[PDB]
Amino acid sequence: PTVSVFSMFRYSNWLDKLYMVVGTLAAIIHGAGLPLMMLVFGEMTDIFANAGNLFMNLEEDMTRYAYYYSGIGAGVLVAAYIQVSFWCLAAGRQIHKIRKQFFHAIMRQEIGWFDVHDVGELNTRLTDDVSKINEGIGDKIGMFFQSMATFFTGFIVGFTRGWKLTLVILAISPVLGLSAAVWAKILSSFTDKELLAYAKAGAVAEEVLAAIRTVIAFGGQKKELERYNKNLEEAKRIGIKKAITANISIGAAFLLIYASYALAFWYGTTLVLSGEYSIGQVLTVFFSVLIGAFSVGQASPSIEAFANARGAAYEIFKIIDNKPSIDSYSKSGHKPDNIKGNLEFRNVHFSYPSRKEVKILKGLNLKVQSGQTVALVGNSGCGKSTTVQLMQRLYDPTEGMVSVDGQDIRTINVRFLREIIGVVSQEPVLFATTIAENIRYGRENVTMDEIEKAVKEANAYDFIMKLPHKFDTLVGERGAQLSGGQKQRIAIARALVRNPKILLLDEATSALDTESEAVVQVALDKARKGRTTIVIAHRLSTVRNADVIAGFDDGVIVEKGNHDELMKEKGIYFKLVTMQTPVSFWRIMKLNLTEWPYFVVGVFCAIINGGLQPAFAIIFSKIIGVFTRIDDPETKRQNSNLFSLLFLALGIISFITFFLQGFTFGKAGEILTKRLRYMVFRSMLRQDVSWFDDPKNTTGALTTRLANDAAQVKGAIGSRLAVITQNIANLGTGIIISFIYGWQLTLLLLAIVPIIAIAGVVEMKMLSGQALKDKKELEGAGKIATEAIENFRTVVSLTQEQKFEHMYAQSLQVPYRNSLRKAHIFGITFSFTQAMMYFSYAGCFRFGAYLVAHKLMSFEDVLLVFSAVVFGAMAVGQVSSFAPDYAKAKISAAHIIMIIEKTPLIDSYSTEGLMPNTLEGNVTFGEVVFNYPTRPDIPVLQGLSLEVKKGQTLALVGSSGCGKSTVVQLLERFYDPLAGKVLLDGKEIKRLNVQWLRAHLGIVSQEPILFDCSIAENIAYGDNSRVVSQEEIVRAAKEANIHAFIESLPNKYSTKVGDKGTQLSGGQKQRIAIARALVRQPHILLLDEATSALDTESEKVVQEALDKAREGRTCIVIAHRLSTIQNADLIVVFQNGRVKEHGTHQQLLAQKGIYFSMVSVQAG
Amino acid sequence: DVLMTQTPVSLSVSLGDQASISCRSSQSIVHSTGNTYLEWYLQKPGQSPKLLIYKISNRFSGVPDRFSGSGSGTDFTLKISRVEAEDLGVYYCFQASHAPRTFGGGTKLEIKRADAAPTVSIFPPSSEQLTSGGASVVCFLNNFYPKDINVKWKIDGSERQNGVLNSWTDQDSKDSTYSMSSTLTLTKDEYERHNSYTCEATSPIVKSFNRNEC
Amino acid sequence: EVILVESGGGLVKPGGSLKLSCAASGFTFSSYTMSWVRQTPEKRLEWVATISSGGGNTYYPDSVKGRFTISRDNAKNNLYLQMSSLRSEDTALYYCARYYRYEAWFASWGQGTLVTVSAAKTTAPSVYPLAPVCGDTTGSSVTLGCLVKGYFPEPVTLTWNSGSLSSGVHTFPAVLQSDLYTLSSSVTVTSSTWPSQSITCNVAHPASSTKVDKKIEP
Ligand SMILES: CC(C)CCC[C@@H](C)[C@H]1CC[C@H]2[C@@H]3CC=C4C[C@@H](O)CC[C@]4(C)[C@H]3CC[C@]12C
Ligand SMILES: CC(C)CCC[C@@H](C)[C@H]1CC[C@H]2[C@@H]3CC=C4C[C@@H](O)CC[C@]4(C)[C@H]3CC[C@]12C
Ligand SMILES: CC(C)CCC[C@@H](C)[C@H]1CC[C@H]2[C@@H]3CC=C4C[C@@H](O)CC[C@]4(C)[C@H]3CC[C@]12C
Ligand SMILES: CC(C)CCC[C@@H](C)[C@H]1CC[C@H]2[C@@H]3CC=C4C[C@@H](O)CC[C@]4(C)[C@H]3CC[C@]12C
Ligand SMILES: CC(C)CCC[C@@H](C)[C@H]1CC[C@H]2[C@@H]3CC=C4C[C@@H](O)CC[C@]4(C)[C@H]3CC[C@]12C
Ligand SMILES: CC(C)CCC[C@@H](C)[C@H]1CC[C@H]2[C@@H]3CC=C4C[C@@H](O)CC[C@]4(C)[C@H]3CC[C@]12C
16 A cells, blocks of 8 residues: 555654745745736736837836836745745655664564565665655645646636636636646656566566576577567567657647637637727736646646655555564663573474474473583584574574573563674674774774784784785675685684673684684683683584584484593484685767668658747737737738638647657667667677676676666767757747847847746756766765675674664765755755746846837837747757756767677687587696686686596585686686696697587586576577477486476476576476486586485486486586595595595595595595 | 618708718628727818718717717717807718728708808900900809809890809808809900900899900 | 828829829828728719738729739838729729728828829810909909819819918819810909019919919909
């Protein structure tokens, strides 16, 4: 649903309510301003028409009416300023309150609620929803009330002057209002139509953009493009249809307006000739009622914007309804004083609310005394991390009761409990500040002496000594600037500065070497005597010196006691220890050069539109002229009929002209967007992996540029030409005709024209909005908001809500003041222009009264000059408001030209190279070194070497991140190494054909990803440029043992799978990845983590096809499960990129090295 | 088309009296707009016509108040109360409502007054005319009333000649009298053949001269 | 004030053509509608033409339509009536007239210019003096005459002493006979005027460029 109206203005103080009341009154005055001017104008032409009697007191009467005009103008100046300022101020203050409350409401939130909610929604929902609320409660409400008052005032003034004419204009007033509203809503910045049309197509893009490396692995660069192109043509067609309808309705509005002119003048002349009404009376009635009925149309976009704001505010109020079930700041919590090391767990059952169907825990009972180093051992999946999280009050347990030193947690304070438990998690995150602040985040008042003692306790001072800015170094995002060991050591320091009572480590020495882990554990025993400690780790070196060792099994703690007790117990831990022992140019036109005819037709119609405002004026003036001259009735009647008929024909010409101009420019614009998007997508696919490595272009640049390139280039060429041509025609010819009829008055008015044009632009731009280009202003605040999400894992040790909230509010302080100032400024400008219109009326007609008094020019001629120039200036401003900006378009087009030129010598579209007819299948690496282009300082390789022969099952064992997938990427022509020599059967890959190597082989990915089609097309993707037989499909499905799961599904080989296979399970998509790779029949086969998520009966049926098909083809398997490693032919072990051991499996098992400690992990 | 007929053609009003002229069309004079366009014009003798009423009841600038126009339907009458001697002349009614515009005609006005006798004076043929073989004797009958009067030429006391030419001025706006001239034209030989030429206004008023040259 | 002076009237043969003009001063010529009206020798007026202020619309009755034409220069302030295919029923006096507000058709009239259409020939007049026999007096006043005779066409101008004598004059209207016109005039002056200072009878016939000043002699 949507919020209530009253809850929208809930955060508004009484001061802001006063602002709203006065702003409403100001808008009502400002709205009643215009029809009164038209009333004065009617009376003024009535005087001018009698001035020449068979000129006396002309200048006097025109002085009187100039005073009237000036007074109305000044009143409107005051009302406009008040109305704008007060509403912008009220909206700004309220939005500041809402941002603060929102950011604070998300802080408490709920444990695991963040995992449920989307990360992108939490960062995006915020800015989008809040900016959408601001627009709805901002000046739009003020303009709505202004329009209402204008409508009522116009109708009242009309009804008072003459009722007969206003009855007819009322009879036609519904259609006028509907037309104005439909015209405006289409014209109300309809960029949402493109995002709606491209919404389907865009999706496909991101799928590709999600996994470019996989799309590189299989031959789908060409196959996806066609799938992208076919999606694109539909949005192209829908857009072309949308442009036809918009222009039809706009032209129909124009026809209706001019038809109302014709009807009003026909009936009004019938009234004037009969003596019922005078001429000025008719002009007053007509223009007042027309303006009112036309402001009813202006009222509508604001109604839509208000509804949209309500819709987006509903969610935010829901967010503040959320309750974490833990009060971080209710000072009603209970705080102990004689805190002593003690842990009590009894009958503890708990499950994750994300997946509540599965029960990990089935009760665990523990009692841990003070100073008792308790280690827990067990394979991954039992919930070591779960107990950790279930220890610092993150979640509450569903069964039992947990206590700490007598009393239970469920009645004491959470924050006081949270500060006293120093915990390091598995993978820590580090705030992107200086390292003095990072290590300061433990507690408030820490001097640099305690800092140094802490870091020296952490033994993380050497790498502090070597780097510059020893306390001022700004660590990069997510610990990317420093190494992992330095990172985990300072994380230990960051925990120790709290001086805790209970210490909880969780995989504290994952990537750490021998001596630093040794000195870390000695420091941990240096500060364990006063505290209770629980340590979780995989290395048994830091475990053997503990107090108590225990073991998880199925969530229940089974084995208890000391080291020797589990030695004589001969359980799983006795099995473990038994086994262990820039440039800017203009080329835009050329991009659209091909579509030369459309523009031509367009240009022509644009000329005619320019000629619609001067021509109007001429006709307009002459009709009034007919009642100024002294003629018999019949002459007045037939001239008036002629000119009214001219109005009708002018409306029809405008209808056809608008239709043609809009149609042709829209057709050319959509064809341009299609061609351009196709070219850019193609070039993105053609680009090298290095181009994808740069983090600017990783997700958002490539996705954004594809939607930003279409919308802009059309504004760069077509809109620019249409608007410049139409304005030049209009203003030029109007000024020329005015020059010829009177030269003094034209110069006088030219002095004032620019103000009227920029006035129209300001008006329309007020309707459109400010676009919120304040990422620079809101930049630090958004950084803080994102880093709170990032460090949400670090929030667990110390919530630090107040610290982040203070940083964020301090960030917001500057935009708030700036925004109040900006609101004042915008009010001043809008008011000045809105008044300058009426001032211009006054001055022009007083100067013209002087002129008529001395017979320098006729009244019809001054009226023609004024009408032409003024109305031309208004139309000029209006037209220049619809055009998009040339600057944005130009910078986009430059980026695009840069994208297309980029060529990383991929050599995928070229045949040239070495093409032998034959091969053997022998690979020889030598002295091969590789450095990532995005990390040029950090080497991950130090010159490995390898020898692979036919059918040689070569295992590659190492730590996580020791150049495992790198050799895959070295083979697959992703990166070409700076140094080294690779001989593929005595044929260097650098001289071969590039696609031939990518054709012969075929691998499985580290993560399985599929495409947005069925599973037949998933497996069919493996083989390209080839007629894919379905017998191979079902044969591969059987060989991968996925046949059963496909034949079990309804619409078996047509079952539509979503993105990345998010419908079916992980093992099944891994198997279908096996099947997809299987149809390649590679002479060289690579497996990377072939059993990451798979059952033990499925691993065998996977490996049987491998074993029967490993013959004849070279096979290279990389995995952590030793099952495929025992049967391998040869085995290579890596350490920081260096080959340490190689040869047969029995040789490495004979000489006990690091591979003996590797294989002997869980066996026995 | 549409014809306009005045009911009286000639009207004789004494000074101080009042009288009315009526102008009846056959078709009703009503424009499409609704206004009715009827105007009354007056032409004094020897003068262009001047506008009197520019719509049935209105009055042009400077028009005296004694003119009063009233018009009902298809019958329209202008009546003057206490008409002065200056206001005599010929009156026309003009109608401009239908596409052919037509005037009425007629409406002569003659102010009644006391009878006057003419100051008669006769003139002898000029030397210049006798030379060319012509002789024309002229008799002016100035400032008399009413219009009806007879002049009789007598040559040598008995010859009542009839080959004369007569012409009437129109009633004079100043004194409401008439004038008229009688010119007896013949040959120089027929004139020389006689001596006495007598002009008699009709107790007639006589004037005469006796010679061919003096 | 409002001054309309029209000119361009002469004698033309039946079926010929002629062009009349009317110059107007004292008002804005381009803001008023202008009409042409015709008066026959039977004292019956008739409407002839009407032109609007811009000159765009032109209205003729169903009696001269297609033969006549009316035009207008607003820059020189001139009104032109072009005539063609004349006839014996066009011999008449033509006025140019102005259009009043409040829907009055003819507010200001011209002086009138005469137009004769026939197959006769121009004939100068014959001015004759007229004085009483031997200058005989009529008491305290004297009446002098003057006689023009046998001219064609009608327009003739007669004054006394270039218009100094204007008080007791009597011009008699012209009588047509045998395709010739005849006109006379009398003036009455005190006895102490005419024998004392001569009186001159000024006569002008523009059709024949004739202009003669005949002194009255005792
Ligand atoms: C939804 C419906 C009720 C719309 C009503 C609009 C009506 C009231 C409008 C539309 C046209 C108008 C009419 C147009 C013409 C005339 C003729 C006039 O001599 C009297 C008023 C009258 C009769 C108007 C009265 C008001 C009127 C009838
Ligand atoms: C969608 C279209 C058909 C709607 C058009 C409705 C309009 C044109 C109708 C509704 C009422 C009508 C008017 C009612 C009364 C009059 C008075 C009459 O003396 C002239 C016509 C006029 C002025 C009519 C013109 C046409 C009119 C204005
Ligand atoms: C709702 C909208 C479309 C209604 C508008 C209808 C208009 C265009 C209609 C209604 C009455 C019509 C007018 C009535 C009479 C004439 C006289 C003719 O010699 C010129 C056209 C003209 C002036 C018509 C033009 C078209 C006209 C003005
Ligand atoms: C830049 C270009 C388009 C300017 C010229 C546009 C034309 C169509 C405009 C400019 C002046 C206008 C003309 C000026 C006045 C008249 C005289 C009138 O009795 C008929 C309409 C007519 C003829 C107008 C028709 C439209 C018109 C010709
Ligand atoms: C977005 C920025 C550039 C504002 C653009 C708004 C437009 C309407 C402004 C900017 C510059 C202005 C022009 C500057 C100079 C002239 C020449 C003058 O003899 C007529 C007005 C005219 C043509 C102005 C019209 C209004 C104008 C075109
Ligand atoms: C935006 C700016 C240009 C507006 C200025 C308007 C000025 C120039 C207008 C407003 C009133 C006008 C004045 C009105 C009366 C007179 C008296 C006359 O004997 C000389 C011209 C003069 C002095 C006019 C000149 C132009 C004028 C002064």
